[PDB]
């Protein structure tokens, strides 16, 4: 039907489509399954001159690597969609995607209709929601339990970084978030929490600063370099 | 017939914003006081020839013009000047100070007629003090 | 079917392409013209159809129309771009016959060439055909009929399907017949000392894809193609009595003219200059406001700073449009369009005598379009014509189909007279020319003879494009035709049959009168003489000389 | 009808000759010819 | 004042970037490693408008070069003139913009231009004159068109006063493939002109005549165009790197060249497109010799601006001017600048920059196609799923009927 | 979303081989391109038939 | 040679056969994207994205065919989407067939391509006559019978599952819009997205919603009864339009030429606070000292808000588009002003605008979709254009039309015997409309996995006994009455359905030859 019409074109129907978007999903699934874990393994990205830069985040692989495929620019952003604005998860959504497609696609050659398997999906997505309400715990910030905080912040910088880098840092993200909770109750990330380059000694002498850091000083020289008490304007 | 824009170069300043309202004022009236003269010697038709340098005839003039019931005709090409002044037996005016009712041709209808997408200015009846006469043959046909 | 190039001779050297002669150039002109004739011969009539042709961008255009079809055919040819040009001087000038004068030229040269053949020189064909000519137009004043005895618009009415047929729309013949005769009688005006000439260009064609053309609303009144200048302006103008103000003057900001060069010395003037720039053009707005003015119309664009008045006054704003759309909005109106705003008094001002009336204006949505509709006028009526169809191609179809319907209607009422349609001009033109130049005898019997023949090819092309049986059409034609001429003055059934002849969609014999088919008598008049000179123009050529582009 | 149009082979190499002018040149050839071997 | 930055952003603005720096570096002197092995003064004391002094001599150029294709940036960076430009001064994302104003622009101004402010903002803060900034952007891409046009804005809102200067290179109808180059270069434009202070036109169109005219090069290759573009680049820069007073500074050649506000549009010329000042007169003002489409005799000259290079004196220019102005009457209008150093490879060179109504032409051409050819709201959804509306489209066929009209009303 | 995966049974049958299989629309390929030849034979036939 | 033509002219029948194997062609791409069961469809374009969709119009804008006469079947989806906006594909599914049934005729028993335009506008009268008949009317202020008619489009979409939330959503967002004849359009309704989130909580809020923050840390982040003011001017001082050019004599000059600079702005400040404003959006970009004095007032300043967002605001605040700033009255000040407040998402900031609630204009309101990705948005938002566009139909025509091919097939029954009492030459293409109409309820059991010979057969021996309401179940694929089954679509659709699909074949079936490159 498209090549009469068109002179050139190529076109995938009834089974070439399905096997596709599965044999795409399980191929993007084996690049991000190592990562997944603490105990996984490492990637860097060197572009063109060779530019490095490392990570185990699955939205940088994704963002970086360009990709031809259909179905996986789907799953980029997807992927990113979701770690935009959470920040956690990218991975998992692409063992889930990745999952998901090929242990019903075993169900599609049995002769299964793709709509009725969706439709159990969606019915089965409701009762997770109302799962999570009774597999959830309350918990009341009016103790302000920074042990409680510490274990939250472990729990990423583990998968990402060893102990050596989790230990020095993890209370700095601790004692920036001990500031965040105030009688406004009012969350402000982008605002109040930064990020600052600044090649020096090494990873493990990353320390918290309470106030404003500044990237620049005084241009001339007889100009006060350290002052006790200076109020700003 | 335009704004005032002579040979030399002619810079305009203003210094003050009452200015800025008369030199518009003064142009509605040097348009207007040189179309007013043209009642005074009743030409009903005017004839322009192509202008250089800047339009021939403005659109600000056109108002004047066309609510006093004057035909207005431009882009005329040169040569055809001295064939319309040897027809109609009008002399050219070059400044208004020169323009008279005595150097104006005459004539009975000075119509346009347009047929099918051809428009024709013709001119019906001609009568001067004249010893060379003039002719016009219009051509028809299929293609050029 | 010319073969074996000619050679390149070496006695006559010119620069550029080689010269030929001989019966190859006239062999060669004949076969140029076939190329354009077949091309035109299929879409004859309402039997015949008609072909695409695209623009190698993807765009095409479905075309019925002879000057459409071959403006697109750009022909390298010489001899092609004659009946090119003639195509493009017939529609514009009658806008009818535009494919039987192609069709005609091509069969007279065809038999023209046949004729050079024969022996007897061009000059004595010429002369055959134009003394032909001068009594078929002697024969056309014969055949004449004025319309009497008849109830209301039928006259104007049967006269446009025929001109509607041969199209898309000729099967909505019916509904679209009303309308377009009652565009007409909308647009009736007076000019040049008592010159009734009814116009076009007068009435509109706007593209709105939708619901179908059986529905074609006809809004009586003028209709514009606008977008709204602010979405907060009120979209429908109630009460009657409707102001228009139709302008021609810029509302964006005023700069000073160019060989202004401003130049001050006080620090403090910039306020004041600033503002005089943005205040005459709020005084030029001041006073139209003033006057009451409920939609102005403008062709120069408005800018933001103005738009503020016209949203706090309830005041309709319209954007840039074409320059002759608004003439015929101020003769509708009464309105008078102004080039620029001044008095003969040395103070400028604004009268009420410049705006129009109208009784209802309101902004109607054609399905993603937004068309300001005006509707009873005061002055002098309009009317607007709203297309609607599948798809874009078909709307471009309909443009030019009612641009043909108008002009066939716009010519009738130029003269009362009219001729019956269906072949029978081009059938009793035959015959009564094959009775003529028998008393003549010796040379000029064979040429007319022929001319006479070269009639016929519109009746069986017609008669082809039906799939039927064209000769069983042609013996009745003819023969009745001419039982007819022979016939004594008084018999009134044989002296019927002068009045009619071939029908298409039957594939019997019937009654013009009855089945409705007719024509203007202008549409015959000034046809065969341009195509005259087309066969004139061809048949004199000799030689044909080329010269190489630099 | 298409845009070859052919009847015998190799219609680009053969190229006919006619009227007058054809002849023309064929006494003239000849004249070529006969003012060689005139003297 | 002292320095001017200068941002490249696309594909084609990090081409004619790169060209543009190894023109201008090997004009006054620095080897691609920074280093300064030139003779003497006069190349060393205007070199701190474009570059940084470093301790230890490493001068660096102020360049800040953007694209949302790693690719492009990635090409220069890894090829030669690779040491010069710092590493940190590049800001590349992925995906593409995908050759679309709408998506592309929205996108990644949503991230990239954050990046940008944060690079323009520190490494600038750097000089102690900011003059304004120089854009080589592609008024018809992605990438380059978008950004562009979100950048002047943010720029311009971070920097006040700082003049604004642009080298967008205007589209080719015949070698631009994509069906929807105009329907981006007249959105850019809607916000070139509501913000820029001073920008000239190059069409690839024009680039591809002249190169296969005088020239002659068989095909042409974006190399050629980049050189050609650079030329003239490197002409109206040393209207500004060389001690000089005509046009002195960038300001100075903004109010020279800019009669009123809203006409930003120039029309550059160059010759000796491959000598004495007389046979150079007829080759800047030779029709064939504009890169812009539009016939520049039909049209009107407003403000001409000549900018000569190598061996001239004040009164061979002058009496040129002289000559020139008596027979080209009806097309007083002059303006030159003396240049004391000659182009790299020429001896002498000169530069010509006229405003002119012809402009209008280039722009009914885009009007034409954007309003005509999408009339059928052809390819619109590609711009209205990124979030931007149809009546923004609405105001931007607006606003050329505003800028046709201008130069209309300056009549022709 | 630029280069398909080029369908990764290529590892199987060669370029040269063409499947049409039916659902894909085989039938409605054939029996209408045949209708071509069809109108040969059809416009052969009978006494005043064309050869 | 001769003119650009005759490479290869075809003429005569294959002319026409290539037509319809061609616009069948069209039909047979989405023939599987019709009823509850259809598939999607992922279309690449060539500059990068991806469209993951079933729409037919969605689906055809992106393809390209070369080919004159297909084209003319692309653009029929535009007629019937920038009409009602519903029924895209059921337009393109019907006119292959219609193309295709009358095709026999005009290949093999030789009727001319006029003769069957005539019978077909005599099938086309007399299927608008039993459509009317076979419709009957609905009440308009039903609520509950409102969601049920707004989710029988729905249902054939990926958000059935949420149809009980997307029906709320529509309907809410079409009262808003619609103005107390009952006209609205879709202009207003904002398409703003946000990905991720969940869609339980995305809801609709009366108001707008913008991708931007304040400018400066002291504003006001929560303001109980906020006063909008619109301004389309830069507050900053401009160039001016005239050649200008200042000449300065004294030393005394340059700092007044400065010092005015400082009092310009502080002069269209002050009289902006007579009204004593709370929110400045302005439409142009703003300058750090005008904003600086909007603050010693109380007001909050923006950055430039397009055009668009401006409109918007000004029917939800009931301000007007203002640019002189020395004519600000408080008259046209906006009020009634719900709340204010900015929430944190890390993509951009987002600021909220909520409405008091309590004729005059129509208010305009922002749809929040909350969805898993960004093509879900993009989906999504199409099944609201198409839910949204039912609302509309029902209030311009009250008449409401059977749905699941029961109104198709009604059309294929009159026409099949009234076919038999209209002896004559029309009776063969007038009785091939009967074999097109079928075959829209025969796409429904294919894709359904039923076998349609003996449903089709069961179907028209109980259509004519049983109830003019018969149709199939396509969850099920078994006949079920359109009563009991409580799903119906307007009746507005089937018009445009019968009216397109047979005057686009009016059109093809007059094509003669086809003649490709021409010229441009
Ligand atoms: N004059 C000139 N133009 C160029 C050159 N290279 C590319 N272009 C122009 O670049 C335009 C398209 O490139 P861009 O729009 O910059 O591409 P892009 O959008 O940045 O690329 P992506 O961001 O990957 O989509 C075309 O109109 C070309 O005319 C060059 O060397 N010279
Ligand atoms: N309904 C009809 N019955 C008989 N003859 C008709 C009918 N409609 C058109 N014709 C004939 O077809 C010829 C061409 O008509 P048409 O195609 O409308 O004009 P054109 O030749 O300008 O395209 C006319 O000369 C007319 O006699
Ligand atoms: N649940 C259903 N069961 C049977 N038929 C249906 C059902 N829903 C829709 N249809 C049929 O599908 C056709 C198209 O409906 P819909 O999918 O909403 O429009 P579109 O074709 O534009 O996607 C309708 O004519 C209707 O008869
Ligand atoms: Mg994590
Ligand atoms: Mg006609
Ligand atoms: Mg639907």
Same mark, same amino acid.
């Given at each position: ?233 | ?144 | ?550 | ?39 | ?412 | ?14 370029? $040269?081989?063409?499947?049409? +299989?039916? /659902?894909? $629309?085989?039938?409605?390929? +054939?029996? /209408? ?19 | ?520």
């Amino acid at each position: 039907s498209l090549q009469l019409l068109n002179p050139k074109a190529e076109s995938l129907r009834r089974d070439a489509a399905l096997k596709v978007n599965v044999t795409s999903a399980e191929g993007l699934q084996s690049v991000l399954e190592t990562n997944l874990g603490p105990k996984g393994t490492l990637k860097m990205l060197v572009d063109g001159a060779g530019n490095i830069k490392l990570t185990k985040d699955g939205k940088v692989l994704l963002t970086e690597m360009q990709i031809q495929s259909p179905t996986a620019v789907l799953i980029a952003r997807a992927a990113a969609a979701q770690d935009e604005i959470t920040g956690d998860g990218t991975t998992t959504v692409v063992c889930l995607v990745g999952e998901l497609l090929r242990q019903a696609h075993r169900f599609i050659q049995e002769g299964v209709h793709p709509r009725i398997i969706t439709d159990g999906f969606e019915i089965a997505r409701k009762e997770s929601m109302k799962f999570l309400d009774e597999f959830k715990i309350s918990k009341t910030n009016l103790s302000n339990d920074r042990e409680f905080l510490l274990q939250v912040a472990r729990s990423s910088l583990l998968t990402k970084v060893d102990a050596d880098l989790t230990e020095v840092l993890t209370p700095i993200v601790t004692d920036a978030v001990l500031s965040v909770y105030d009688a406004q109750a009012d969350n402000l990330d982008l605002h109040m929490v930064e990020i600052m380059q600044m090649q020096h000694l090494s990873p493990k002498d990353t320390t918290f600063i309470k106030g404003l850091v500044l990237d620049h000083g005084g241009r001339h020289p007889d100009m006060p370099t350290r002052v006790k008490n200076a109020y700003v304007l | 017939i335009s704004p005032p824009k002579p040979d030399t170069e002619n810079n305009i300043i203003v210094n003050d914003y009452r200015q800025m309202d008369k030199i518009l004022k003064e142009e509605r009236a040097y348009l207007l006081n040189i179309c007013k003269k043209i009642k005074k010697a009743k030409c009903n038709v005017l004839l322009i020839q192509k202008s250089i340098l800047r339009d021939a005839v403005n659109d600000l003039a056109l108002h004047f013009l066309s609510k006093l019931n004057i035909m207005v005709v431009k882009d005329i090409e040169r040569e055809e000047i001295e064939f319309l002044s040897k027809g109609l037996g009008c002399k050219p005016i070059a400044d208004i100070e020169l323009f008279t009712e005595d150097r104006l041709g005459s004539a009975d209808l000075v119509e346009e007629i347009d047929s099918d997408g051809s428009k024709i200015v013709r001119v019906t009846g001609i009568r001067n003090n004249n010893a060379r006469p003039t002719v016009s043959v219009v051509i028809r046909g299929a293609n050029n | 079917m010319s073969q074996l190039f000619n050679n390149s001779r070496s006695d006559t050297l010119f620069l550029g392409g080689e010269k030929i002669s001989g019966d190859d150039i006239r062999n060669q002109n004949v076969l140029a013209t076939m190329a354009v004739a077949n091309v035109v011969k299929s879409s004859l009539g309402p039997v015949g159809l008609d072909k695409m042709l695209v623009d190698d961008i993807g765009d095409f255009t479905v075309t019925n129309d002879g000057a459409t079809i071959l403006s697109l055919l750009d022909v390298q040819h010489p001899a092609g771009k004659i009946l090119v040009e003639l195509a493009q001087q017939q529609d514009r000038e009658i806008g009818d016959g535009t494919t039987s004068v192609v069709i005609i030229a091509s069969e007279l040269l065809k038999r023209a060439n046949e004729l050079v053949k024969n022996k007897i020189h061009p000059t004595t064909i010429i002369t055959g055909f134009r003394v032909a000519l001068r009594e078929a137009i002697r024969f056309i004043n014969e055949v004449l009929s004025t319309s009497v005895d008849t109830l209301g618009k039928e006259t104007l009415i049967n006269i446009a399907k025929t001109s509607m047929s041969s199209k898309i729309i000729g099967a909505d013949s019916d509904f679209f017949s009303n309308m377009v005769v009652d565009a007409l009688l909308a647009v009736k005006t007076q000019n040049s000392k008592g010159e009734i000439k009814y116009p076009v260009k007068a009435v509109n064609v706007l593209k709105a894809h939708g619901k179908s053309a059986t529905e074609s609303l006809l809004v009586p009144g003028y209709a514009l193609n606008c977008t709204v200048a602010s979405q907060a302006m009120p979209k429908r103008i109630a009460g009657g009595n409707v102001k228009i103000a139709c302008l021609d003057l810029n509302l964006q900001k005023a700069r000073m003219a160019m060989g202004v060069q401003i130049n001050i010395d006080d620090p403090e003037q910039l306020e004041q200059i600033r503002k005089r720039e943005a205040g005459i053009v709020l005084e030029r707005v001041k006073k139209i406001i003033d006057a009451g003015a409920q939609v102005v119309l403008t062709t120069k664009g408005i800018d933001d700073l103005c738009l503020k008045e016209f949203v706090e006054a309830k005041i309709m704003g319209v954007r840039r449009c074409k320059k002759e759309d608004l003439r015929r909005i101020a003769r509708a109106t009464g309105a008078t369009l102004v080039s620029s705003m001044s008095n003969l008094e040395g103070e400028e001002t604004f009268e009420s005598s410049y705006l129009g009336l109208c009784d209802e204006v309101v902004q109607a949505k054609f399905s993603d379009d937004e068309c300001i509709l005006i509707k009873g006028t005061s002055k002098h009526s309009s009317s607007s014509i709203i297309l609607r169809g599948a798809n874009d191609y078909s709307l471009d179809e309909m443009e030019r189909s009612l641009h043909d319907s108008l002009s066939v209607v716009k010519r009738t009422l130029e003269s009362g007279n009219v001729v019956p349609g269906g072949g029978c001009v081009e059938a009793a033109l035959n015959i009564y020319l094959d009775n003529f130049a028998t008393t003549v005898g010796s040379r000029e019997q064979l040429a007319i003879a022929e001319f006479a023949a070269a009639l016929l090819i519109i009746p069986k092309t017609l008669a082809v494009n039906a799939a039927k049986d064209s000769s069983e059409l042609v013996a009745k034609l003819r023969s009745y035709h001419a039982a007819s001429q022979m016939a004594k003055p008084e018999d009134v059934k044989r002296r019927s049959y002068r009045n009619y002849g071939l029908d298409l969609i039957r594939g019997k014999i019937v009654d013009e009168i009855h089945a409705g088919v007719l024509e203007p008598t202008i549409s015959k008049v000034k046809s065969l003489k341009s195509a005259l000179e087309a066969c004139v123009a061809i048949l004199r050529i000799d030689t044909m000389i080329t010269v190489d582009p630099e | 009808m298409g845009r070859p149009f052919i009847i015998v082979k190799d219609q680009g190499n053969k190229k006919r000759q006619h009227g007058l002018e054809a002849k023309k040149s064929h006494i003239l050839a000849a004249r070529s010819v006969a003012s060689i071997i005139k003297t | 004042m002292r320095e001017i930055i200068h941002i490249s952003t696309g594909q084609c603005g990090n081409q004619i970037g790169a060209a543009f720096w190894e023109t201008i570096c090997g004009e006054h002197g620095l080897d691609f490693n920074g280093t300064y092995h030139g003779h003497d003064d006069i190349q060393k004391e205007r070199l701190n408008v474009y570059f940084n002094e470093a301790s230890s001599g490493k001068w660096v150029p102020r360049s800040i070069n953007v694209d949302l294709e790693p690719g492009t940036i990635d090409a220069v960076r890894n090829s030669a003139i690779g040491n010069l430009f710092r590493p940190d001064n590049y800001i590349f994302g992925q995906s593409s913009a995908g050759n679309v104003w709408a998506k592309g622009h929205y996108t990644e101004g949503a991230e990239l231009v954050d990046s940008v402010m944060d690079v323009i903002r520190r490494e600038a803060e750097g000089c102690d004159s900011l003059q304004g900034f120089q854009i080589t952007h592609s008024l018809g891409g992605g990438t380059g068109s978008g950004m562009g046009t979100l950048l002047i804005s943010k720029i311009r809102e971070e920097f006040p006063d700082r003049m604004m200067a642009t080298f967008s290179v205007l589209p080719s109808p015949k070698t631009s493939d994509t069906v929807v180059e105009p329907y981006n270069a007249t959105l850019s434009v809607h916000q070139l002109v509501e913000h820029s202070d001073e920008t000239f036109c190059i069409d690839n169109e024009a680039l591809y005549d002249i190169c296969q005219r005088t020239l002659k090069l068989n095909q042409p290759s974006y190399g050629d165009l980049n050189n050609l573009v650079s030329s003239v680049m490197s002409g109206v820069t040393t209207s500004l790197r060389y001690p000089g007073q005509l046009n002195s500074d960038l300001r100075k050649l903004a109010v020279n060249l800019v009669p009123f506000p809203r006409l930003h549009f120039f029309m550059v010329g160059y010759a000796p497109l491959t000598l004495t000042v007389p046979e150079l007169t007829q080759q800047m003002f030779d029709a064939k010799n504009m890169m812009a489409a539009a016939d520049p005799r039909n049209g009107r000259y407003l403000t001409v601006a000549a900018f000569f290079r190598g061996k001239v004196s004040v009164k061979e220019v002058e009496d040129e001017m002289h000559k020139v102005q008596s027979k080209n009457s009806d097309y007083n209008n002059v303006q030159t600048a003396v240049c004391s150093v000659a182009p790299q490879g020429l001896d002498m060179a000169a530069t010509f920059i006229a405003n002119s109504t012809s402009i209008q032409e280039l722009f009914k051409r885009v009007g034409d196609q954007f309003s005509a050819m999408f009339k059928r709201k052809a390819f619109l959804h590609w711009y209205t799923s990124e979030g931007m509306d149809e009546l923004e489209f609405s105001e931007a066929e607006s606003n050329m009927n505003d800028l046709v009209s201008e130069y209309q009303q300056y009549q022709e | 979303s630029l280069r398909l995966p080029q369908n990764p049974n290529a590892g199987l049958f060669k370029q $040269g081989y063409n499947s049409y +299989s039916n /659902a894909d $629309g085989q039938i409605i390929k +054939s029996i /209408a391109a045949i209708r071509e030849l069809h109108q040969m034979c059809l416009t052969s036939m009978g006494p005043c038939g064309r050869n | 040679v001769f003119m650009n033509a005759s490479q290869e002219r075809t003429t005569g029948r294959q002319a026409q056969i290539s037509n319809i194997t061609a616009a069948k062609a069209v039909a047979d791409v989405i023939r599987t994207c019709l009823g509850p069961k259809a598939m999607l469809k992922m279309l690449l374009d060539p500059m990068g994205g991806l469209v993951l969709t079933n729409d037919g119009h969605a689906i055809l804008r992106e393809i390209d065919v070369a080919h004159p006469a297909a084209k003319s079947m692309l653009e029929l989806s535009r007629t019937q989407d920038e009409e009602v906006g519903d029924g895209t594909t059921t337009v393109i599914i019907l006119a292959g067939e219609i193309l295709a049934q009358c095709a026999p005729y005009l290949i093999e028993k030789n009727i001319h391509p006029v003769i069957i335009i005539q019978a077909l506008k005599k099938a086309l009268t007399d299927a608008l006559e039993v459509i009317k008949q076979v419709s009957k009317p609905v009440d308009v202020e039903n609520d509950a019978a409102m969601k049920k008619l707004i989710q029988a489009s729905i249902g054939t979409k990926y958000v059935i599952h949420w149809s009980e939330k997307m029906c709320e959503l529509a309907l809410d967002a079409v009262k808003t819009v619609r103005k107390d004849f009952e006209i609205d359009i879709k202009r207003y309704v904002r398409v703003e997205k946000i990905p991720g989130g969940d869609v339980l909580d995305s809801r609709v809020l009366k108001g707008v919603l913008l991708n931007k923050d304040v400018v400066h840390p002291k504003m006001s982040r929560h303001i109980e009864n906020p006063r909008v003011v619109l301004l389309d001017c830069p507050l900053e001082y401009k160039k001016g339009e005239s050649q200008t050019n200042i000449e300065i004599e004294k030393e005394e000059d340059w700092n007044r030429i400065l010092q005015i600079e400082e009092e310009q702005v502080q002069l269209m400040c002050e009289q902006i606070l007579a009204v004593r404003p709370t929110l400045v959006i302005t439409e142009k970009g703003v300058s750090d000292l005008a904003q600086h004095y909007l603050l010693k007032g109380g007001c909050s300043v923006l950055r430039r808000v397009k055009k668009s967002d401006n409109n918007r605001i000004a029917r939800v605040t009931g301000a007007t588009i203002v640019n002189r700033v020395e004519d600000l009255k408080e008259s046209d000040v906006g009020t009634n002003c719900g709340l204010f407040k900015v929430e944190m998402i890390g993509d951009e900031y987002f600021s909220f605008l909520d409405n008091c609630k309590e004729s005059g204009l129509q208010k305009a309101c922002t749809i929040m979709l909350r969805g898993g990705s960004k093509d879900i948005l993009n989906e999504i938002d199409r099944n609201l254009q198409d839910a949204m566009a039912v609302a509309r139909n029902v209030m311009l025509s009250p008449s409401l039309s059977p749905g699941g091919g029961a109104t198709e097939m009604a059309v294929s029954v009159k026409l099949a015997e009234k076919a038999k009492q209209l002896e004559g030459i029309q009776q063969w293409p007038y009785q091939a409309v009967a074999d097109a109409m079928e075959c829209i309820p025969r796409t429904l059991i294919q894709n359904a996995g039923g076998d349609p010979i003996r449903l089709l057969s069961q179907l028209r021996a109980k259509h004519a006994q049983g109830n003019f309401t018969t149709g199939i179940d396509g969850d099920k694929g078994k006949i079920v009455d359109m009563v009991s089954y409580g799903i119906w679509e307007p009746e507005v659709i089937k018009q445009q359905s019968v009216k397109t699909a047979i005057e686009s074949a009016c059109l093809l079936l007059r094509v003669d030859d086809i003649v490709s490159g021409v010229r441009k």
